[PDB]
Amino acid sequence: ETTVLVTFEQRLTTGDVGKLSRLIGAVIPIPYRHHLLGSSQVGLDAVVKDKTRDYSRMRARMREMTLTIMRRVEGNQMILGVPTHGQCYTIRNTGPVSWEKGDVLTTLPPVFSGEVTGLVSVSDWDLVLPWIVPMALATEINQRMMMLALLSLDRSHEEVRAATAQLRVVRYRDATLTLPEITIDDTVLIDMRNVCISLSMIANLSSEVTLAYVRKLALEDSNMLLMKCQEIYNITPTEELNKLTALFVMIRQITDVISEQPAFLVCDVSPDDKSALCIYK
Amino acid sequence: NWTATELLPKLDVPIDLLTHIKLSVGEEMFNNFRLYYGDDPERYNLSFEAIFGTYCNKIEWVTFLGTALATAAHAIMFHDLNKMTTGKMLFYIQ
């Protein structure tokens, strides 16, 4: 189905539906993809009041949510259109980012700066929306998940907390967004292994051509980026290509680790920066 | 409310502006603005409260004599009763 007529059967007001009327065109996920759904499934809030309440379980759980687009909130009826891949759709923002037209946009959890009443707590249930953040932000906020998960292994707990307090502040396009203050979890641990697996194999699959470049570049040339990199031979080319091909599979694999599911491709950011023609789920 | 602004018929009236209405919400010379750039589905959306009829509780009226207890009473009006002390029926018994 595409048109998901949702009767949120809960006890809502005009001021509630006065918010969704102004939000027609936003992103509501549904877990089930019926034609007829209710308040308890529609809206992502049903999983953010879980007791573990970390990005470990919720990142892997919104990958089973199915995104829809808010249309025509009549009374409590919804027209949540399951978008078919490759059509153009206007998409209303909920994350405080101007979305920088032309980029990949992805679906992130409601970011761990409190817990927003996404609509209003209708009978102790608010309709909380995932933030529709760009590709750079979700990759950076999931990099720092692993950054504080790596140093959760080799330091004392106060120095783990010294790591988290340093890197929980993320400033990216008018958003000062916050790390979960991570509970170390097995779902990240099987992923943090696969990172450290992949990092070792790059040190194997890089021959003596790649790594000799920059360490000889600092011998002769002086560059602005090289001033940070200082602070941080066989003749057969075909096997150098053939080792570098399998190297690039690793760095796409480890990028896909700190990535999430790609989603909406921004076509036309509005001049008021509140809607965007989006395609390519 | 603003759906009432967009749906209902308005008076049309000549109005001046200082500079420009898209800038007149900048320093906010107009109190409580609302601005839309495109085809906006808000006025195509409604709601009620749907209050239905406030039914009155017409309560049943009873009097002392209308109830069945009146046979147990010999009910007498006497208007100078507040002056009395102790009604004291004497019974002579042969």
TrEMBL record, chain A:
Q: What is this protein called?
A: Uncharacterized protein
Q: Do you know which Pfam families this protein is assigned to?
A: Herpes_V23 (PF01802)
Q: Which GO terms describe its cellular component?
A: viral capsid
What are the top taxonomic ranks of the organism? Viruses, Duplodnaviria, Heunggongvirae, Peploviricota, Herviviricetes
Q: Which UniProt keywords apply?
A: Capsid protein, Host nucleus, Virion
Which GO molecular function entries does the Swiss-Prot or TrEMBL record give? structural molecule activity
Which InterPro entries does the UniProt record give?
Herpes_capsid_2
HAMAP family in UniProt: HSV_TRX2
